[PDB]
Amino acid sequence: NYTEELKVPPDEDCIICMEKLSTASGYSDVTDSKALGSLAVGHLTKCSHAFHLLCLLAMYCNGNKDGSLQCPSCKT
Ligand SMILES: [Zn+2]
Numbered sequence: 694n695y696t697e698e699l700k701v702p703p704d705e706d707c708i709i710c711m712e713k714l715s716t717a718s719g720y721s722d723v724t725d726s727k728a729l730g731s732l733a734v735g736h737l738t739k740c741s742h743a744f745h746l747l748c749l750l751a752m753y754c755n756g757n758k759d760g761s762l763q764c765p766s767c768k769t
């Protein structure tokens with residue numbers, strides 16, 4: 694993960710699959726997950742929010758191109 698991981702999922706709820714941050718990544722079905730498996734909650738250091746890491750890595754191919762992912766919440 695590239696964002697300060699959280700021993701436990703917050704109550705912000707994912708923003709990609711729009712699912713509870715407790716459950717898991719909704720795109721886990723079809724996603725180019727590298728090492729985010731499908732159960733890692735991390736708040737992007739950029740803004741510092743929270744979202745299914747894996748999920749982000751999905752749409753991350755659009756923005757925040759460097760070596761991590763972008764924040765789906767505030768498009769950070
Ligand atoms: Zn998600």
Ligand SMILES: [Zn+2]
Nearest residue numbers: 740764767769
């Ligand atoms: Zn954000």
